[PDB]
């Protein structure tokens, strides 16, 4: 989506540290004080109107949980113009998550989305959501499926601020482009859903007392993988996945008793591409 297209007056805060009000000067006041003019620039565009936009200096002026009164004072006759009373608390339009670097770890349909939140100081308040669609897009922008990022035990905003999640339900196969957007929860901070992220073309690794994994490779291909001994301590992981060389269809490795196995079979052709067969974990 677009940062400006998200109402006589429109305002939006992407980090609750900066605010930007626009329509189509822009005098604003915090409770009781002498009004000041927000620095305004004219973004003239033939398609739309004049599109007057100003950005607050983001210095001790985006104070939260305070009523802000906006009145437009045009230089024509200083008459009454567009007005809006807003809570910078309650008009948040948070920036989308960045550095998504999502990988299809854990379950074969599972997609780990460990992201570095662009705003690290408010990552607790924001309630993110994602939209993921197939690269083919057989129905244009019809697949707007959205999974809310609640604070479950497997999708929290863990540190190294950033966060992580374990959104599931994504079918195995074609690489999925996904954009996350952030909106304040509403319990303390309120606002509209943030602009969508840049569509990142992440992929998932398709589909397929010692245990032998009897797998066969196709013609003119390779055979390699890793095995993560995460010991199911926590659902999410850090940015760097664990790497463990599959040293011998006859791969042999030592694993903890009654522990989960994060198996992976990776096939790369002569040209060089990602083509993997992932198997479900076993206890």
């Amino acid at each position: 989506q677009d940062v400006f297209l998200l109402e006589p007056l429109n305002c939006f805060s992407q980090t609750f540290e900066d605010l930007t009000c626009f329509w189509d000067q822009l005098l604003y006041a915090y409770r009781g004080e002498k009004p000041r003019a927000c620095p305004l620039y004219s973004q003239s565009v033939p398609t739309f109107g004049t599109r007057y936009v100003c950005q607050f200096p983001a210095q001790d002026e985006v104070r939260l949980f305070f009523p802000l009164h906006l009145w437009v004072k045009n230089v024509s006759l200083n008459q009454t113009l567009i007005q809006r009373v807003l809570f910078v608390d309650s008009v948040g339009l948070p920036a989308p998550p960045r550095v998504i670097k999502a990988r299809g770890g854990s379950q074969p349909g599972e997609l780990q989305i460990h992201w570095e939140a662009p705003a690290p100081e408010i990552s607790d308040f924001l309630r993110h959501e994602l939209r993921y669609g197939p690269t083919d897009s057989s129905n244009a922008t019809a697949p707007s499926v959205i999974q809310l990022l609640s604070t479950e035990t497997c999708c929290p905003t863990l540190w190294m601020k950033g966060g992580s999640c374990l959104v599931s339900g994504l079918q195995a196969g074609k690489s999925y482009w996904l954009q996350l957007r952030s909106q304040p929860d509403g319990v303390s901070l309120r606002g509209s859903w943030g602009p969508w992220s840049f569509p990142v073309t992440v992929d998932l690794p398709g589909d397929a007392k010692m245990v032998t994994c009897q797998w066969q490779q196709q013609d003119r291909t390779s055979s390699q993988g890793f095995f993560r001994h995460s010991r199911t301590r926590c659902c999410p992981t850090d940015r760097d996945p664990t790497w463990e060389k599959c040293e011998e269809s006859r791969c042999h490795f030592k694993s903890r008793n009654d522990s989960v196995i994060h198996i992976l079979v990776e096939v790369t052709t002569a040209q060089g591409a990602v083509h993997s067969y992932l198997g479900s974990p076993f206890w």
């Binding site: 001790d60 104070r63 939260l64 949980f65 305070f66 608390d89 100081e121 607790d124 308040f125 303390s188």
Partner: protein
């Protein structure tokens, strides 16, 4: 507003980060003019004998006096790294005051004991104490009592 525990934790964490960042940044020599800072010593004995209203006005006066001290503090710190730090601190205190006024109510501000401090480290420490002492205790013990 301030009812959210995550808001209080975020305020505490941000104040702690600011305090840590002040130490890294050099040229923090104190100014001759003192900075008036609130009264944050709470005696465990006078915490059953004070009702909700008196504690509310005391905390509001504390946070407001902290804001006035910081505003003077920024004015004190000549534009520099240690002003950027004081600007971030003023933003922190303003956020806390705005959160408190939503739940606890404006009511009537009151003035308590007056303490004078010299270095900005004192400002950061006293803000950390306010988010550690009276504010934390009122928001953690009288949470359900006062929010509704």
């Amino acid at each position: 507003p301030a009812c959210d525990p995550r808001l209080l934790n975020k305020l505490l964490r941000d104040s702690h980060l600011l305090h840590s960042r002040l130490s890294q940044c050099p040229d923090v020599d104190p100014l001759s003019i003192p900075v008036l800072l609130p009264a944050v010593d709470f005696s465990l004995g006078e915490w059953k004998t004070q009702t909700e209203q008196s504690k509310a006005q005391d905390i509001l006066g504390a946070v407001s006096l902290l804001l006035e001290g910081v505003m003077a503090a920024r004015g004190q710190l000549e534009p520099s790294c240690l002003s950027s730090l004081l600007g971030q601190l003023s933003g922190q205190v303003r956020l806390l005051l705005g959160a408190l006024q939503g739940l606890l109510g404006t009511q009537l501000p009151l003035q308590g004991r007056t303490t004078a401090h010299k270095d900005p480290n004192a400002l950061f420490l006293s803000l950390q104490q306010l988010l550690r002492g009276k504010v934390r205790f009122l928001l953690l013990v009288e949470g359900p009592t006062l929010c509704v």
